[PDB]
Amino acid sequence: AMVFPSEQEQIEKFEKDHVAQHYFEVLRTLISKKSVFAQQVGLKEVANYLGEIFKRVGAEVEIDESYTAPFVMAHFKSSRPDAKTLIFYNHYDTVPADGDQVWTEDPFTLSVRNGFMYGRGVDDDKGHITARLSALRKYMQHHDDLPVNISFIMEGAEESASTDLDKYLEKHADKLRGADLLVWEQGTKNALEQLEISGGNKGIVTFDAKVKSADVDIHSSYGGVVESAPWYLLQALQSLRAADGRILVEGLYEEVQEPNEREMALLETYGQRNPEEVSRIYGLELPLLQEERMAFLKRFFFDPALNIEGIQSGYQGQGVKTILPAEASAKLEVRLVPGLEPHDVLEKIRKQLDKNGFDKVELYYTLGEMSYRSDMSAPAILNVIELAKKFYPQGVSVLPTTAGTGPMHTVFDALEVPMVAFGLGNANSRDHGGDENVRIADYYTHIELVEELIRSYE
Amino acid sequence: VFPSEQEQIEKFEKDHVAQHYFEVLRTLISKKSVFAQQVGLKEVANYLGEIFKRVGAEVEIDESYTAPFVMAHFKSSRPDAKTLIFYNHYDTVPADGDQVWTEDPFTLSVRNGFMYGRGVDDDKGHITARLSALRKYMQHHDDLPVNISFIMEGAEESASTDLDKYLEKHADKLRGADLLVWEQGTKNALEQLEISGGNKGIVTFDAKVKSADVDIHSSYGGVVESAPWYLLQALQSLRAADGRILVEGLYEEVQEPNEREMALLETYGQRNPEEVSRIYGLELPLLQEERMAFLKRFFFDPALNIEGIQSGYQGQGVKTILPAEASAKLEVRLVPGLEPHDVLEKIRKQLDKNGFDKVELYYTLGEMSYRSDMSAPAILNVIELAKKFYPQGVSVLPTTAGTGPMHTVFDALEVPMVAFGLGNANSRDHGGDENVRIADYYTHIELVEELIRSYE
Ligand SMILES: OC[C@H]1O[C@@H](O)[C@H](O)[C@@H](O)[C@@H]1O
Ligand SMILES: OC[C@H]1O[C@@H](O)[C@H](O)[C@@H](O)[C@@H]1O
Ligand SMILES: OC[C@H]1O[C@@H](O)[C@H](O)[C@@H](O)[C@@H]1O
Ligand SMILES: OC[C@H]1O[C@@H](O)[C@H](O)[C@@H](O)[C@@H]1O
Ligand SMILES: [Mn+2]
Ligand SMILES: [Mn+2]
Numbered sequence: 001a002m003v004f005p006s007e008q009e010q011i012e013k014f015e016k017d018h019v020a021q022h023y024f025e026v027l028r029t030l031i032s033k034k035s036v037f038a039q040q041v042g043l044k045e046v047a048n049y050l051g052e053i054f055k056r057v058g059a060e061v062e063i064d065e066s067y068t069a070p071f072v073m074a075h076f077k078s079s080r081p082d083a084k085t086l087i088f089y090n091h092y093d094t095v096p097a098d099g100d101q102v103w104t105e106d107p108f109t110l111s112v113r114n115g116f117m118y119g120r121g122v123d124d125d126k127g128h129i130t131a132r133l134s135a136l137r138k139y140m141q142h143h144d145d146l147p148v149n150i151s152f153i154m155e156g157a158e159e160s161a162s163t164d165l166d167k168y169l170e171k172h173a174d175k176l177r178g179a180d181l182l183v184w185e186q187g188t189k190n191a192l193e194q195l196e197i198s199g200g201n202k203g204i205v206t207f208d209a210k211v212k213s214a215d216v217d218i219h220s221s222y223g224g225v226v227e228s229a230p231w232y233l234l235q236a237l238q239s240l241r242a243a244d245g246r247i248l249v250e251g252l253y254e255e256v257q258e259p260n261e262r263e264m265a266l267l268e269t270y271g272q273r274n275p276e277e278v279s280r281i282y283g284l285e286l287p288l289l290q291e292e293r294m295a296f297l298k299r300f301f302f303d304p305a306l307n308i309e310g311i312q313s314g315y316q317g318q319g320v321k322t323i324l325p326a327e328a329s330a331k332l333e334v335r336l337v338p339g340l341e342p343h344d345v346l347e348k349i350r351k352q353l354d355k356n357g358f359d360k361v362e363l364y365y366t367l368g369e370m371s372y373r374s375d376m377s378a379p380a381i382l383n384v385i386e387l388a389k390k391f392y393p394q395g396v397s398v399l400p401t402t403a404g405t406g407p408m409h410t411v412f413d414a415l416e417v418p419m420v421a422f423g424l425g426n427a428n429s430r431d432h433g434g435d436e437n438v439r440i441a442d443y444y445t446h447i448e449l450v451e452e453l454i455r456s457y458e
Numbered sequence: 459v460f461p462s463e464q465e466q467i468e469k470f471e472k473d474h475v476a477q478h479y480f481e482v483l484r485t486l487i488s489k490k491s492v493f494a495q496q497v498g499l500k501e502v503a504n505y506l507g508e509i510f511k512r513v514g515a516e517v518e519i520d521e522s523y524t525a526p527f528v529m530a531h532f533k534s535s536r537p538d539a540k541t542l543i544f545y546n547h548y549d550t551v552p553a554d555g556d557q558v559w560t561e562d563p564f565t566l567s568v569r570n571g572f573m574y575g576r577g578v579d580d581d582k583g584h585i586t587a588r589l590s591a592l593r594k595y596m597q598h599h600d601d602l603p604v605n606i607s608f609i610m611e612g613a614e615e616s617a618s619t620d621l622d623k624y625l626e627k628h629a630d631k632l633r634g635a636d637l638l639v640w641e642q643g644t645k646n647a648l649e650q651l652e653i654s655g656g657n658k659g660i661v662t663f664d665a666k667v668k669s670a671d672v673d674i675h676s677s678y679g680g681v682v683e684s685a686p687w688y689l690l691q692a693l694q695s696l697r698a699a700d701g702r703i704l705v706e707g708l709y710e711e712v713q714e715p716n717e718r719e720m721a722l723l724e725t726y727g728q729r730n731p732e733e734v735s736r737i738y739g740l741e742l743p744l745l746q747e748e749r750m751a752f753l754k755r756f757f758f759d760p761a762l763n764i765e766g767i768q769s770g771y772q773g774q775g776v777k778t779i780l781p782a783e784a785s786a787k788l789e790v791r792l793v794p795g796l797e798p799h800d801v802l803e804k805i806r807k808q809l810d811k812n813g814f815d816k817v818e819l820y821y822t823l824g825e826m827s828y829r830s831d832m833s834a835p836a837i838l839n840v841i842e843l844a845k846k847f848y849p850q851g852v853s854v855l856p857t858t859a860g861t862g863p864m865h866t867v868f869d870a871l872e873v874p875m876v877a878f879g880l881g882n883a884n885s886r887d888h889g890g891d892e893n894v895r896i897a898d899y900y901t902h903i904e905l906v907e908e909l910i911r912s913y914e
């Protein structure tokens with residue numbers, strides 16, 4: 001028997017809440033200050049501003065400027081002895097406004113229209129920073145002390161693969177290790193307005209593959225006797241993957257951590273009802289590689305995948321060109337799951353190609369990110385799940401991992417604290433797109449959930 | 459017994475007829491004639507028309523289709539005289555981009571005992587050398603002992619567009635001939651004159667796959683099939699590791715080589731398959747390694763080739779997409795018995811049967827194949843005459859691996875066909891600094907003159 005406020009009620013609460021309003025003006029200022037890692041613009045400016053903001057309400061603040069993007073930490077202390085610690089991880093850099101992106105109003109001007117707030121960073125990730133601070137300060141309106149120690153860590157290079165995050169966390173692990181729970185930088189409601197509460201990221205390894213079959217393109221009259229670069233490469237790739245998408249590389253699945261019973265039960269309960277709908281959404285013309293719902297979800301969340309991002313050889317254009325191309329190349333990737341490390345995955349692929357008779361395929365490592373997940377059974381995570389249900393009428397969607405890539409493995413490796421992601425995004429927030437937005441009611445609801453999480457530590 | 463190269467060059471220098479047509483060649487080369495660019499076609503056809511008319515030939519320039527068809531007939535007075543036909547083309551490929559040209563491609567240049575220019579080998583030089591041979595003969599005899607017809611088309615480099623129609627129209631003036639001499643021929647790397655009697659064929663076509671409306675984030679790569687995987691799977695289902703084509707009903711249509719054809723291969727085919735590996739710097743094993751297996755595959759079997767394939771992202775860095783589209787440019791090299799349209803339809807059926815109905819196929823070009831076992835007496839005569847002019851001997855092959863209109867010409871004319879000419883293994887047809895050895899050019903003249911004399 002749970003009752004929930006209406007969207008109209010949430011918006012009025014938001015309008016009447018002096019603390020939420022104070023930090024909404026702070027959000028306006030933050031959005032206005034462009035902070036992009038890849039344009040080197042405004043990182044120190046935003047990191048210092050955040051420093052002042054948190055100092056004002058009594059946090060002990062440290063701004064480490066050792067690497068390109070300053071690393072901001074703000075610790076709020078509880079007077080309770082044997083108090084636990086809560087960590088909020090967030091980032092203050094955003095992607096550029098840019099491209100063929102359509103903006104109704106200036107991307108760096110926080111704009112409110114039709115019950116949504118618009119601006120570069122309102123969802124990813126600055127809005128999450130002002131909402132979580134709002135929550136703490138609201139709790140502080142009605143209490144003399146915090147029931148739990150609270151640490152905010154804000155990096156400035158999340159959109160450029162969290163450059164040097166590993167070096168900041170190693171440097172400051174002593175103050176962070178041992179916390180009860182770490183809440184991730186963002187989260188969203190899904191298409192059914194269920195709050196997604198997730199516990200992992202998949203990883204990836206990307207690499208170039210190249211073949212040189214001869215010193216020059218040869219006349220195609222020789223194609224019956226002379227092997228060409230594209231045939232060799234097609235044969236090589238075809239050797240590494242079954243028609244159902246299973247990867248044919250020895251040693252690879254042996255390293256994969258299989259999902260436990262809880263993880264499989266979570267998928268059953270919370271995974272999309274009809275994942276076969278991707279066919280409609282993208283106008284697929286070929287059948288899915290895995291069609292039954294659970295086979296599909298399990299492949300999607302818990303299996304790796306060998307992907308061709310591009311392949312090219314010989315002649316493109318109008319007309320013909322009677323050649324056996326000397327060179328062929330491809331841009332490949334393997335999506336990873338826990339157990340699989342980028343360099344090692346590539347070495348197993350080198351070995352299998354050599355064993356298959358394709359030693360002339362050259363491989364060149366380009367990028368890697370490690371994967372991470374949990375079965376969402378840590379009691380600190382269970383607490384979050386039960387509290388969230390009191391705030392979202394459509395309920396929650398609990399997932400061991402999302403299919404996105406991110407720094408979760410880096411963070412857990414340094415800090416070893418249980419991690420959970422939830423936030424104030426909507427399925428159509430357009431992160432990284434034009435008119436990035438957050439629903440005003442969703443933003444206020446995240447404040448209330450975070451304040452309730454703090455109260456749960458009393 | 460055989461003249462030296464130095465003697466040949468001197469003979470060439472002192473021969474007023476050869477020198478006259480060598481200046482004619484200079485002019486032909488200077489006039490760019492490329493079918494694909496529709497440049498110079500009427501200009502070169504008209505100029506040739508006049509060159510032949512001047513020496514008393516009965517000339518017809520048919521301008522019905524894009525490239526004018528030129529015919530020049532020289533009559534013998536002998537009443538039961540046979541007829542000899544020369545087929546040649548006056549169009550060339552362009553000079554081009556990546557190609558290295560020491561001097562202007564459209565300026566005949568002589569260096570180190572070679573002549574250089576676009577068309578000196580393929581095919582303008584063959585035209586002037588053959589008219590030289592006829593006219594040289596006429597310096598020493600009262601009349602031709604055989605009727606001689608020159609047929610010159612201007613679309614050979616573009617698959618002989620409308621040749622078939624011109625031959626249908628003029629077949630009454632041409633059918634009944636004793637022998638037809640093909641457009642060009644070369645000496646092989648061992649300086650043996652190649653004498654051949656066939657062209658392989660070709661069917662080229664685009665293959666395309668659309669797998670979705672849009673490029674999808676590659677995180678879906680374990681559940682959504684992409685266009686490039688589907689296409690690689692389709693292409694691989696059609697070709698065995700050893701190059702054999704896996705298409706039902708294809709090999710059934712292949713005409714097997716007879717005993718003479720195989721014996722010719724064995725005698726005159728390359729001595730060593732592995733030389734190809736050395737020449738091209740091959741980094742992969744040959745698809746057929748034993749000599750006779752290699753040779754039979756090269757001249758007498760079809761082959762499925764990828765000229766190009768592309769999909770998704772090329773460029774700096776990565777792009778986390780499953781591409782929605784992939785395409786390829788394919789061809790099947792053909793042998794007698796295989797027709798372009800039928801071959802492509804058999805590939806359509808196999809792909810559907812194999813589960814690849816979504817690969818789209820678009821026919822783009824086709825040429826039928828042709829060959830003979832080189833036993834026609836009119837052809838044997840050429841093989842014997844040639845042994846008197848080339849100290850390294852001759853190389854007799856039923857077919858070259860190149861493509862050409864032999865099938866179209868035979869279908870209209872039904873005259874025994876033989877290819878021999880003035881190129882060298884390094885003439886670089888279709889390439890930069892295309893060239894003919896001066897001595898080789900004059901030797902061709904003398905061999906063609908002797909061919910005429912053999913009809914007395
Ligand atoms: O049960 C063993 C492990 O299985 C993994 O798949 C889960 O992500 C872990 O949280 C769990 O500890
Ligand atoms: O008290 C708040 C929460 O703190 C976590 O450390 C405990 O594991 C939960 O059981 C508890 O509900
Ligand atoms: O023996 C039958 C036929 O075999 C074919 O392979 C040859 O090209 C023909 O010249 C011959 O007439
Ligand atoms: O007379 C020249 C040649 O004409 C051909 O028609 C005959 O078949 C040959 O035997 C002869 O040598
Ligand atoms: Mn983010
Ligand atoms: Mn030619």
